[PDB]
Amino acid sequence: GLEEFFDDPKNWGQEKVKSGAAWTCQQLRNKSNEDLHKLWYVLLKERNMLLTLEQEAKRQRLPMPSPERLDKVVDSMDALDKVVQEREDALRLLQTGQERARPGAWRRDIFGRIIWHKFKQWVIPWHLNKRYNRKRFFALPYVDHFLRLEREKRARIKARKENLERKKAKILLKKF
Amino acid sequence: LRNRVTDRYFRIQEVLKHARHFRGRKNRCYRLAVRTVIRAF
Amino acid sequence: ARNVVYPLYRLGGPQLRVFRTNFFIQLVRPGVAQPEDTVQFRIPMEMTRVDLRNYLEGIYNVPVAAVRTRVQHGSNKRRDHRNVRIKKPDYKVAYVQLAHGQTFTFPDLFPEKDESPEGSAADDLYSMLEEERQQRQSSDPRRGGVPSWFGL
Amino acid sequence: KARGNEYQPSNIKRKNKHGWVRRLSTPAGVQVILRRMLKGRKSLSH
Amino acid sequence: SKVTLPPHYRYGMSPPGSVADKRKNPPWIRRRPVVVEPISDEDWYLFCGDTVEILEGKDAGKQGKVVQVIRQRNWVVVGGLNTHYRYIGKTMDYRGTMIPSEAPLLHRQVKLVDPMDRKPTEIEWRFTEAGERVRVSTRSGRIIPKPEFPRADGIVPETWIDGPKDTSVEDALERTYVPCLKTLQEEVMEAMGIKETRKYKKVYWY
Amino acid sequence: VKKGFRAAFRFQKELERQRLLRCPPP
Amino acid sequence: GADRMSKWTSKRGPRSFRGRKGRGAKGIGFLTSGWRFVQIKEMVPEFVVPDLTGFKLKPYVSYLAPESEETPLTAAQLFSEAVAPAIEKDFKDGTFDPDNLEKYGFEPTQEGKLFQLYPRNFLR
Amino acid sequence: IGIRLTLPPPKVVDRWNEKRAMFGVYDNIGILGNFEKHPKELIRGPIWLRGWKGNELQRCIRKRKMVGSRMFADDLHNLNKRIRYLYKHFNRHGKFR
RNA sequence: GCUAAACCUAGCCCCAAACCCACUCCACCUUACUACCAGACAACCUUAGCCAAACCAUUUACCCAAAUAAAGUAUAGGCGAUA
RNA sequence: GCUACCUAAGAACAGCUAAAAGAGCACACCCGUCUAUGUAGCAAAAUAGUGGGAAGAUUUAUAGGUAGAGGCGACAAACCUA
RNA sequence: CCUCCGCAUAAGCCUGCGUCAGAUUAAAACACUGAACUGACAAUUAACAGCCCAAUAUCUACAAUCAACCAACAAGUCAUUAUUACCCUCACUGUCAACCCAACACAGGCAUGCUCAUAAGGAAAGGUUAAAAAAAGUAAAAGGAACUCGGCAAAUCUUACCCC
Ligand SMILES: [Mg+2]
Ligand SMILES: [Mg+2]
Ligand SMILES: [Mg+2]
Ligand SMILES: [Mg+2]
Ligand SMILES: [Mg+2]
Ligand SMILES: [Mg+2]
Ligand SMILES: [Mg+2]
Ligand SMILES: [Mg+2]
Ligand SMILES: [Mg+2]
Ligand SMILES: [Mg+2]
Ligand SMILES: [Mg+2]
Ligand SMILES: [Mg+2]
Ligand SMILES: [Mg+2]
Ligand SMILES: [Mg+2]
Ligand SMILES: [Mg+2]
Ligand SMILES: [Mg+2]
Ligand SMILES: [Mg+2]
């Protein structure tokens, strides 16, 4: 029901809700997948209620009773997602020997940079895909001078950084 | 800026101390004080 | 789910199912007067009316009769000290109308507090401050400025 | 007459004349975008 | 909770997220950085909760307990010893309540004290062959212990009771996982009895 | 700032002389 | 001139530009001849919500619980705790044959089933 | 107003530095080392000026000759323009022709 | 005595050494930052001029092998500026 | 995205006299004859009045096209972002 | 007292006189507290409008103008059929404002519909005095272009001739 967007009515305006110990990745790995699913939905409802309370506190111009609860829930769901993703990654590596469950390819775009292009699951083959064949994955080498200029700019920034590190170290040693 | 001038104030005062009894802006402003002190000397 | 790639549906294909949804919604207090069966939510941009209806009836078992949505444009008028515009996020709000005649009034969460437990970290220093204030406010206009400390 | 109002805004004309697709449609426009990238502009096009 | 500080930011006896610190160092501020001694994480001996000896200052030779450690400026605040006086309750018609308030001390200004004779002593970090890693005094050669201090959680674990939303230890540690070659999707599908008979078909990725 | 010490010393002496002129000791 | 720095959204162009841009919501159907929108039931994500009546697992943990050394799960660990015991038993019994790894949990191709792993058929 | 109101921090100089105390050592190494090494080979610095004095135009020409193939593009454009300008100035302008 | 004044250190420069960078998820060549559809077009080419020749009309160093020396020599050239 | 010319597909033109009309009076609308003010001005070309046209070789919204050794021009050496 | 305004849509713009607090300060061409503002909070809800369509052949001489007589030229703004394929449905986006182009809270510029003076919308005078010079008007004895380069301007309604 809609009462699940709010906590126990006895806690309304009580300035403190003594609870903690967000879930740990190890403790979530200790659990099974059905338990993980059910706990995910429990955490989802708790997070929704906490977000509702935070927004209402902002509207009322009052501090949130215990804001760390939201952080605990958020990181607990992040740990649960990490555990599920780890199990999935291990299973995919075991069965197909692959990472990056989104297929892609190292390509080189119109500006001459090296990009990782992720695929887009179309329904017709690429050779008669009209929109796809308008993107250009090649150089046309009027871009090579710009590539060298960008490389030199990167080198200048790196040289400045190293020189500044040297100067700071020299000052530190000069005093101490 | 290798070795710019540091003691310009003392040269300005060298000229200006002979203008203290003048009248107008030439007792404090160097650009007019220098001319009037040259004429006075 | 959000920030994910949807499988491409082909005619005759299976049902698209999400098992651990990525949508979080806020139940907001209306800023204007609304019908008694209208509940106002603040939902992510990628959520739709069907998504929110299924969310409400599957997670909270709330019977939903209607859903309408709109996009509120956050202000891009505030300037930083560097004269850089600060953008308040655009968000999406939804008005849901309950199904079987139910009504919903937004609760009053913050009233009322009544507690007087013992304290040491802050209440002791508050007793400090209050006692010093109550003891050191004994000035006299009849004295004209002479310090009221010496016994002589 | 008065000649300060030479700008008559229209998003269609703007995007057609100085848009990303119009830039990339020609090797000269690609080099315009590359110059913007080299200079570090926050907006490479309209 | 997650706020990034400017590259040259002054740590100033108040937490970076505090209102006082926001007042003192607004984002517009730029001032000369304080340069501090570089000390690694494996040779900082004095921790929040041990007794130190003040070598010099307004009070030299008096023993005290550190109450706060600021590693970003090599600061240790000694409890109510190196103090100056200030007022806290401030109004336009009456102000009083003068209190002592500590000023931070650099780590050369204080030295560690061993509980045998209560004397200043130098500490070397000698790796014990039992597995743990603790401090050792130089002159006499004793094990100075890491002092017990309340943690940043603001809790005491012994006087802790489970709330209505806290899972108990038994059912939080009970292992229900059986490793399998099936995904979460298959497991929940079969557990909840969802029947899908039509098949997914070939799609072109590019 | 301008690097140097001679002008700074001269100006410090001038300021000390002016302070002595303004507030002569008994 | 025009605002170059503000993000291009669906509120900014003419009437045709509005309604084409969108805000990132995923489509659930198509448009027919009379501008009528046909919804596809299978294109709408169906929320798979479990039963929580007898579920004793709260969204927090007790402080009395003890710490444990972290150990991220690897494919090697999953294989060791999933297939190693069975294949060890049926090799000790002498029934293990290297040709048919299928009955140990492996499958040659991933096209046949519904939730294929590498292209990631499913949603989340 | 131009002068600082305070005295600058006193700058101490260690005259018996390692570098200051060892300055000049192994000079005259050719004279009293059987001329196996030249003192010009004790010089550290840019590759295009070690044991070479040169003019400013001469320095630019030498730098472009010796190291101008692995220079940055903008730096090399600047060097070419500087050589052009310096040629014009030292060959067409000034007193004493 | 107001306005003001003053301040070191952010950083930068020139060298040396060393060959340097870039997918957390999602989106981005269409009106870029847009989940999802049937003509498949496609790049490869001698710079010029200012300026100098006291005008200008042939001509006028500038190109990518460590240095140095041969040597500003042989040569070229409105045989002249210069190369 | 001004402006010159063009292409596609649009819109506007009261009332009276209607000779039939690149006809007349006359609004909206387009232009700018003369005067006065203004001249760091409301305005980097405006205001008030007065005027020419106003069913046409008219005015006008939208999108597109032609560009500088050029474009476009009912040739003013006009216009092509003051 | 004014209204030659206004209300919508399009285009443009993008939160830009809604609430609360600070108003000690800060922009208000001065002020109260709100158009030349600071922070927080809140709102624009689709039916209106955008966002369309399965192929392969085939069809499509007769304007509009109350479309009826009549009358034209510059000759025009709207249409299918045959066979195959197809039984799921109401998603997404715009929706605020005292607003845009002119460096401005600029006597300028700005498409269409609707009433053409209103049921919309607004205020020329900070206070005083009653000099000159200046600007815009009103009235003027007798005369009536004697003015002036010129009947410019103003007021009255105007004949005849010439050049191009
Ligand atoms: Mg010449
Ligand atoms: Mg000359
Ligand atoms: Mg000439
Ligand atoms: Mg006519
Ligand atoms: Mg007429
Ligand atoms: Mg002519
Ligand atoms: Mg002419
Ligand atoms: Mg409206
Ligand atoms: Mg202007
Ligand atoms: Mg009214
Ligand atoms: Mg007024
Ligand atoms: Mg008056
Ligand atoms: Mg007045
Ligand atoms: Mg008269
Ligand atoms: Mg006369
Ligand atoms: Mg006369
Ligand atoms: Mg007249």
CB-strand contact D28/J, under 7 Å? no
Which nucleotides of strand J lie under 7 Å from a protein CB? 1-2, 32, 43-46, 62-65, 81-82
Quote the CA–CA distance of D25 and E151 in Å, as a whole number.
62
E137 φ, ψ to 5°?
-75, 155
Q: The CATH number of the domain where D27 resides is what?
A: 1.10.287.3980
CATH number of C1-152: 3.30.70.330
Q: How far apart are CA G23 and CA C71, in angstroms?
A: 9
**Tokens 């800023």 belong to which residue?**
C31
How many folded domains does chain D comprise?
Answer: 1
The separation between the first and the last C-alpha atoms of chain H, rounded to the nearest angstrom, is 46
Domain that holds residue D16: 4-46
Give the strand pairing for C26-27 and C78-79. unpaired
Give the CA count within 13 Å in the CB-facing half-sphere of B28. 3
CA distance E164 to E167: 8
CA distances from A170 to A70, A163, A174 (A): 46, 11, 6
Starting at the edge strand found earlier in the chain, the sheet holding E123-127 runs E123-127, E133-137, E143-144
Please, which residues bridge with residue C26 across strands?
A: C42
- Whether the beta carbon of D25 falls within 7 A of nucleic chain J: the reply is no
Write down the domain spans for chain H. 1-96
Residue nearest to nucleotide I39 (CA to C1'): A128
Distance A159 CA to ligand 5 centre (A): 80
| C113: enclosing H helix or E strand | none
Own/partner long-range contacts of E43-48 (Cβ < 8 Å, ≥24 apart): E43/E125, E44/E71, E44/E107, E45/E112, E45/E123, E45/E125, E45/E135, E46/E76, E46/E107, E46/E110, E46/E112, E47/E146, E47/E147, E47/E149, E48/E149
- Residue identified by tokens 């500080």 is E5
The DSSP bridge partners found for residue C137 are none
Domain with E132 in it: 5-148
Residue G91: CB partners within 8 Å, gap ≥ 6? none
**3-state class of E69 per DSSP?**
strand
Looking at the DSSP bridge assignments, the partners of residue C70 are C93
For E90, the token pair is 């401030």
What are the tokens at C81? 């000290």
- Residue C64 pairs with which residues in a beta bridge? C98
DSSP tally for chain H: helices H, then strands E: 3, 0
Structure token digits, residue E136? 């050792």
DSSP states along E85-151? EEEEEE-SS-EEEEEEEE--EETTSEEEE-TTT--EE-EEEEE-TTS-EEEEESSS--EEPPPP---
CA of G37 to C1' of K140 (A): 84
Residues F11 and B11: beta-carbon distance below 8 Å: no
Cα–Cα distance measured from residue C30 to residue C28, given in angstroms and rounded to the nearest whole number: 6
Q: Is C19 exposed, middle or buried (0-12, 13-18, 19+ CB in 10 A)?
A: buried
Q: Which ligand is nearest the CA of H92, by number?
A: 2
> Beta strand G60-61 with C64-72: parallel, antiparallel or unpaired?
unpaired
Closest CA to C24 of A74, B23, G79, A168: A74
The whole-angstrom separation of Cα E162 and Cα G60 is 10
Beta strand C64-72 pairing with C91-98: antiparallel
Containing H/E element for A48? helix A33-60
φ/ψ bin of A97: left (φ > 0), alpha (ψ from -120 to 50), beta (otherwise):
left
Say if CB G105 and CB E181 are below 8 A apart.
yes
Residues lying close to strand K (Cβ under 7 A), chosen from 26-65 of chain A, are 55, 58-59, 61
Chain G touched by C46 (CB under 8 Å): yes
Kindly state the tokens that stand for H2: 């131009």
Say how far apart CA E76 and CA E64 lie, in whole Å: 11
Q: Are G120 and A102 in contact (CB under 8 A)?
A: yes
Q: Where are the beta strands (DSSP E) in chain G?
A: 29-31, 37-39, 46-47, 60-61
Residue G111 DSSP symbol: S
* Location of structure tokens 């126990």: A8
**Residue linked to tokens 């479990």:** G50
CA angle (C34, C39, C42) in 5-degree steps: 110
E205 SS3 class = coil
Q: How many CB atoms lie within 10 A of CB E114?
A: 20
The minimum CA-CA distance between C139 and chain A, rounded to whole Å, is 37
Locus of tokens 């390692």: H18
The closest of A28, G23, A35, E183 to C17, measured between CA atoms, is: E183
Of C34, G54, C129, A37, nearest in space to E98 by CA: C129
Contact check, Cβ <8 Å, A94/E173: no
Segments in chain D forming alpha helices (H): 11-18, 20-24, 27-39
Is the C-beta atom of G1 closer than 7 angstroms to strand K?
A: yes
Strand partners, C38: C97
CB count in 10 Å sphere of residue A28: 22
Q: How far is the CA of D2 from the centre of ligand 6 (A)?
A: 28
The nucleotide closest to E32 (CA, C1' atoms): I9
Q: Which nucleotide is nearest to A140 if distance is taken from CA to C1'?
A: I43
Taken in order A23, A27, A29, A33, is the CA torsion positive or negative? negative
